């Protein structure tokens, strides 16, 4: 039997009971939409958690604490790994800074000295200027002018912070300097602390020219106003501003390719015994719970789908019993049990698949409505931008559509399998003769 012939026969036998076929299709549609929306709630929870993690952290910063046994981590070996863009060797020393450029000054300006060739070759943050190469030359951040302000403005800032009394609401101080910082002779005066601990020996005269500005700090996080120094001063920094015993904290970035490559690098480094942590670390930490939640919601949708498949089975048993006579005549002519079984399995799977398709459409609509409603209800507390939180249900049935179609079609086939066997096991003699 040709496929077109089977479709025509299904059309003929479905036009007989338009109301019943439409009602079982509607039951399947409600079950599929219910499954998709319910599992979409979990998919959206996973997506919003992943998006929040990816937004509150830089994705590619695969930070490694070290190796088991406190083995030192060399710079050379990190380069010879799979698909590594470049390794970041940023060094931070916990100490206040007394830059004091002319009448202006900066306070935090924590030291970020490191070999800048590797950093700028690791897609570092910058928009203007040149990398620090000369002896008296550094790269400055963007918020440097925010803290740069005259001596009277510094006294005003000090009075404001003293009178703040731990109330950072009336602390809106003027920016001060609103001009170009490039090509200047800032007399940097980084504070000493007897190298590391407590005594303050002598603050060097880092008369370093300003060439190089960093752009806006990452994804609306971290303060970039801190001064960045190259590797040219490493020798005298270790000689005078000794930091090795304690105060030093050299965070390691290990930048790389797209997020899947980040995950591959993370698991490769973990297999070696490294103390790896990144966005994928938290993602995998929550991923077991997210998989469990998605499986549970899909199983709840599955019991709803079984509720609808029982109705499909009732409809198909009444379709087999209702005719039994077209089936009897086809079997008498020689339609074969295989063709009849394929016919009725096709009818059951068509009910299930039409129900699943329009349930997918209705569930896309319902997920869009939920995306338009959840912020509209939960605003004024955390959805100030409204482009966050449940702004996830547009893509959600990407593999969920495939899973829903597979589940609903398969369960419809299971429900129609018994009526198909009934149809193929109709006795020709009894079916042909009338039943008075």
């Amino acid at each position: 039997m040709r496929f077109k012939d089977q479709v025509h026969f299904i059309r003929r036998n479905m036009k007989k009971n338009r109301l019943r076929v439409f009602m079982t299709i509607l039951a399947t549609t409600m079950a599929c939409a219910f499954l998709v929306v319910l599992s979409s709630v979990g998919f959206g929870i996973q997506k919003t958690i992943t998006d929040m993690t990816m937004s509150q952290q830089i994705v590619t910063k695969v930070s490694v604490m070290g190796k088991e046994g406190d083995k030192p981590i060399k710079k050379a070996d990190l380069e010879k790994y799979d698909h590594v863009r470049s390794v970041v060797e940023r060094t931070q020393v916990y100490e206040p800074n007394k830059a004091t450029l002319g009448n202006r000054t900066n306070e935090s300006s924590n030291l970020i000295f490191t070999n800048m060739n590797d950093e700028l070759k690791a897609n570092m943050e910058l928009e203007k200027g040149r990398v620090a190469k000369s002896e008296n030359e550094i790269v400055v951040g963007y918020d440097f002018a925010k803290r740069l302000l005259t001596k009277k403005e510094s006294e005003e800032y000090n009075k404001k912070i003293e009178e703040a009394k731990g109330n950072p609401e009336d602390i809106k101080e003027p920016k001060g300097y609103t001009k170009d910082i490039l090509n200047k002779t800032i007399e940097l005066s980084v504070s000493k602390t007897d190298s590391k601990t407590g005594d303050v020996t002598k603050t060097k005269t880092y008369d370093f020219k300003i060439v190089g500005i960093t752009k806006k700090p990452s994804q609306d996080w971290m303060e970039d106003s801190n001064i960045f120094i190259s590797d040219q001063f490493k020798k005298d920094f270790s000689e005078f501003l000794d930091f090795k015993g304690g105060n030093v904290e050299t965070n390691i970035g290990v930048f790389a390719d797209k997020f899947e490559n980040v995950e591959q690098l993370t698991n490769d480094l973990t297999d070696d015994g490294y103390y790896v942590t990144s966005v994928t670390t938290e993602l995998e930490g929550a991923n077991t719970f997210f998989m469990v939640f998605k499986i549970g919601l899909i199983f709840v949708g599955c019991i709803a789908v079984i509720i609808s498949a029982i109705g499909i089975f009732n409809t198909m048993t009444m379709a087999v019993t209702e005719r039994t006579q077209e089936i009897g005549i086809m079997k008498a002519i020689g339609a074969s049990p295989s063709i009849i079984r394929r016919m009725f399995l096709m009818e059951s799977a068509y009910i299930g698949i039409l129900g699943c398709v329009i349930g997918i459409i209705i569930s896309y609509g319902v997920s869009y409505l939920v995306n338009l409603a959840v912020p509209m209800i939960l605003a004024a507390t955390s959805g100030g931008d409204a482009g966050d939180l449940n702004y996830t249900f547009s893509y959600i049935p990407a593999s969920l559509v495939i899973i829903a179609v597979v589940i609903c079609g398969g369960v419809a086939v299971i429900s129609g399998m018994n009526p198909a066997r009934k149809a193929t096991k109709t006795n020709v003699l009894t079916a042909l003769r009338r039943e008075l």
Binding site: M1, R2, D5, R12, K16, A332, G334, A335, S336, P337
Partner: protein, 231 residues
């Protein structure tokens, strides 16, 4: 050309605790030649209906063997029996067994749809088959809107459209007028005359049987008087 040698069958009707095996067949040795109207006349429950259902493929004989067109069909399963019925059989059941709905054109085309013939030749095939039978001015006429005679004729049309070699039939005039019975039997006569085809009609009478080229009487199951009666 049909060979039914030493075939018997018993109806095991009843509950598991109320089994009752009543034999309706008693080792028949029916023989049918090619291109002839073999008529098997008996009575209700004598064995004509059981023999037709056995040769058709709805019932597997308990003992013996059957050769149809040089092919053993005793051990055939449902799939192969149905395939055989598709490519080499035709059916003219008494009630005309027409699908409710399913306009007469589609009703005739139904076995071609079952076999898998493409619609392009299907249209023309149904057309000339309906013309030959004599119901071509009906097109989209439902079988329920037809009379008994023309329903039997369109059943014949559904039988011949696949061009079979055996067109075994139930009583073709069981519910028919005298004139309709005469014209349908004349149609069967012209059918066998013009196109080589074998009829295994079973009748509850003798006037219809006289059309057949052979007489096979089933007195409660045993065949008697089996001769090739020339028409």
């Amino acid at each position: 050309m049909i060979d039914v040698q030493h075939i018997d069958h018993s109806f095991t009707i009843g509950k598991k605790g109320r089994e009752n095996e009543v034999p309706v067949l008693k080792d028949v040795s029916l023989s049918v030649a090619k291109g002839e109207i073999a008529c098997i006349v008996g009575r209700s429950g004598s064995g004509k209906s059981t023999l037709l259902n056995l040769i058709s493929g709805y019932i597997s004989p308990t003992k013996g063997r059957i050769v149809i067109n040089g092919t053993d069909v005793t051990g055939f399963n449902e799939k192969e029996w149905a395939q055989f019925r598709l490519d080499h059989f035709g059916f003219i059941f008494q009630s005309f067994q027409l699908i409710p709905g399913l306009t007469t054109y589609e009703n005739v085309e139904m076995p071609l749809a079952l076999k898998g013939i493409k619609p392009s030749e299907r249209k023309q095939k149904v057309q000339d088959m309906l013309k030959r039978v004599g119901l071509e001015n009906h097109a989209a006429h439902y079988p329920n809107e037809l009379s008994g005679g023309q329903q039997q004729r369109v059943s014949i049309a559904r039988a011949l459209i696949l061009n079979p070699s055996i067109i075994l039939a139930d009583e073709p005039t069981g519910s028919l007028d005298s004139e309709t019975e005469h014209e349908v039997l004349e149609l069967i006569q012209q059918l066998n005359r013009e196109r080589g085809i074998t009829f295994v009609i079973i009748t509850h009478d003798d006037e219809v049987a006289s059309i057949g080229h052979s007489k096979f009487q089933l007195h409660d199951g045993v065949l008697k008087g089996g001769i090739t009666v020339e028409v």
